[PDB]
Amino acid sequence: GSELETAMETLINVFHAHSGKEGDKYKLSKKQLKELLQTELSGFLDAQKDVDAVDKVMKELDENGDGEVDFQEYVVLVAALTVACNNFFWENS
Amino acid sequence: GSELETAMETLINVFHAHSGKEGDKYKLSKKQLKELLQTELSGFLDAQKDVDAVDKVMKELDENGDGEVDFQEYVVLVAALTVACNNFFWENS
């Protein structure tokens, strides 16, 4: 297909949107990322099938505050929580 | 926003679409992933600003054939190539 490209542009759209606000408009911070993550995934957080997995990521930012990440990194996490809330990947039957 | 969720569903839509075809409909293979990757990112491959970075991923699958990956992994790679072709993250001015 070709929709894949549409998704990539969508992810960057949001990331670029929160890129401003507070901090330098070039990268996201661990503290700021904490909000950006849930702020958007707020819908998924509503019902987490595996909070234990998400907790690891939530506390990960708590440990590092002055730290930072990149765009790709923002794409990895979102997928981590998406799976935790989505059981369409835990199928075994 | 809330579009982020739309992107997540889009990515899974394609992945789930190619999940069938050949092999077990549960996970993607290194060999099969090679096609799925470019097959979709075929548009980006048209003009790669940094083929050196992509080559590392392309040859990565060549090394491992009987290997395998997961959904999240498919989300990490796509972001790797997206950045290589996208210079909106290499800004320095």
Among A4, A12, A17, the residue with its CB nearest the CB of B11 is A4
Is A4's CB within 8 Å of B78's CB?
yes
Mutation site for A-interface testing, chosen from B6, B8, B16, B90 by largest number of A Cβ within 10 Å = B8
A12 touches chain B (CB under 8 A): yes
B87 touches chain A (CB under 8 A): no
B93 touches chain A (CB under 8 A): no
B51 touches chain A (CB under 8 A): no
Cα(A63)–Cα(A31) distance, integer angstroms: 10
Residues 6+ apart with CB under 8 A from B27: B19, B68, B69, B70
B57 touches chain A (CB under 8 A): no
H or E segment and range at residue B44: helix B30-45
Is A14's CB within 8 Å of B8's CB?
no
For residue A41, the chain B residue with the least C-alpha distance is: B5
Centroid of chain to Cα B54? 10
Which tokens go with A49? 């099938």
Q: Name the fold adopted by A1-93.
A: Recoverin; domain 1 (1.10.238)
Name residue, tokens 């090394």.
B63
Closest CA to A54 of A42, A64, A67: A42
Cα(A71)–Cα(A91) distance, integer angstroms: 30
Name residue, tokens 């981590």.
A80
Is A76's CB within 8 Å of B71's CB?
no
Handedness of CA B22, A9, A57, A69 (dihedral sign): positive
Is A79's CB within 8 Å of B89's CB?
no
Instruction: Give the Cβ contact number of residue B61 at 10 Å.
Output: 19
